[PDB]
């Protein structure tokens, strides 16, 4: 499949890349998707919902084998205000919160998470090139299966002044950045 | 002895408290000091050097018996830029790096340490109310005697943004925060 969005076997999916080459995104049965990549550029893709909700409990299971810069996350957006957010469950060779401003900590689903915000300036988004805030919750106890109670994150972010607008999509995604890897993830 | 600074038996000392009562700081022979506290407020005191240096090997030995929130550390300041720093060898009921941004890890003097930074905004300092970064290196294997090679910590912090302009004081200190305890520490 090429970059874009749609529905597959009951689930919304989104797949984006920077045009560099080196990545295959594949939709599988039910809530499954796979990603295989080798000397990629920047990409992110996965399965979930359009729209997401502010209290969804998201389950993920499978195998995640990055070789380099990559992360596995609950990933989504809100509109009005435009916000990109990540609840990062595992990552590869680089902590994607590096350089973001730490706002606090929240405990959820068996781990402490560190909470951060940063600003993206004139960058691609669901509504076109824009400037917008990006929120992060990064799990300390890395894992490739589990359950994410999104309300714990959204509420902790709100306590630190981190407002979310009207929900757009909400997926479990694999991201890569100039790396290689494989992953097979099933969402529920 | 009252809050303030000076020299005792050849060692610089600093003792500070928030005026809340419940702390008795004493200077002993050579590099020795003791603290006894009961339902204290915030305080920090100990012996060392004015100025410190960027490669001092600091030796300490004794007994550290907090009952509540407290830490035992190499504590100091630098100027231009203004920096407060702690190399924490032991602590009581609260890990003082909670909420700080983890920067990395360093191995020194028989243990791994986690390093962190946080921004202090309009807080007291050696030069008056100021906004500055506070650096932490927190020993995983707690102890109340040992040798601290400060260069290993300064180098780890410098990897993640610390610059040393001119050093100010550098002491082995007992801190407490709304707690009780006793300690007797000898520096050299």
Swiss-Prot record, chains A, B:
GO CC annotations? extracellular region
- List the pathway annotation: Glycan degradation; xylan degradation
* Activity dependence on pH, as recorded: Optimum pH is 4.5-5.5. Stable from pH 3.0 to 8.5 at room temperature and from pH 4.0 to 7.5 at 40 degrees Celsius.
Catalytic activity from the UniProt record:
Endohydrolysis of (1->4)-beta-D-xylosidic linkages in xylans
Cellular compartments annotated:
Secreted
Please state what class of enzyme this protein is: hydrolase
Sites of glycosylation?
36, 59
What does the record note about the induction of this protein?
A: Induced by D-xylose, dependent on the cellulase and xylanase regulator xyr1. Repressed by glucose through negative regulation by the crabon catabolite repressor cre1.
Which GO BP annotation is one of this protein's?
xylan catabolic process
Active site residues according to the UniProt entry:
84, 175
Single GO molecular-function term? endo-1,4-beta-xylanase activity
Residue intervals of the GH11 domain: 1-187
UniProt keywords, alphabetically:
Carbohydrate metabolism, Glycoprotein, Glycosidase, Hydrolase, Polysaccharide degradation, Pyrrolidone carboxylic acid, Secreted, Signal, Xylan degradation
Query: EC no.?
Result: 3.2.1.8
Ligand binding (substrate): 71, 75, 86, 120, 124, 134, 169
Question: Which top-rank group of organisms is this from?
Answer: Eukaryota
Q: What does this protein do?
A: Glycoside hydrolase involved in the hydrolysis of xylan, a major plant cell wall hemicellulose made up of 1,4-beta-linked D-xylopyranose residues. Catalyzes the endohydrolysis of the main-chain 1,4-beta-glycosidic bonds connecting the xylose subunits yielding various xylooligosaccharides and xylose. The catalysis proceeds by a double-displacement reaction mechanism with a putative covalent glycosyl-enzyme intermediate, with retention of the anomeric configuration. Produces xylobiose and xylose as the main degradation products.
Q: Which family does it belong to?
A: Belongs to the glycosyl hydrolase 11 (cellulase G) family.
Q: What is this protein called?
A: Endo-1,4-beta-xylanase 2
Organism encoding this protein: Hypocrea jecorina (strain ATCC 56765 / BCRC 32924 / NRRL 11460 / Rut C-30) (Trichoderma reesei)
Q: Which residues of the full protein are shown?
A: 36 to 223 of 223
């Amino acid at each position: 499949i090429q970059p874009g969005t749609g529905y597959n076997n009951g689930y919304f999916y989104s797949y984006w890349n920077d045009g560099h080459g080196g990545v295959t995104y594949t939709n599988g049965p039910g809530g499954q998707f796979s990603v295989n990549w080798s000397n990629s550029g920047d990409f992110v893709g996965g399965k979930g919902w359009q729209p997401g909700t502010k209290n969804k409990v998201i389950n993920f299971s499978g195998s995640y084998n990055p070789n380099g810069n990559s992360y596995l996350s609950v990933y989504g957006w809100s509109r009005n205000p435009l916000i990109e957010y990540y609840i990062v469950e595992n990552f590869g060779t680089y902590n994607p919160s590096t350089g973001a401003t730490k706002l606090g900590e929240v405990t959820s689903d068996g781990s402490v998470y560190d909470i951060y915000r940063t600003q993206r300036v004139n960058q691609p988004s669901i509504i076109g090139t824009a400037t917008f805030y990006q929120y992060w919750s990064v799990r300390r106890n890395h894992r490739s299966s589990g359950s994410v109670n999104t309300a714990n994150h959204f509420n902790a972010w709100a306590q630190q002044g981190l407002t979310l607008g009207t929900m757009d999509y909400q997926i479990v995604a694999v991201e890569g950045y100039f790396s290689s890897g494989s992953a097979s993830i099933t969402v529920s």
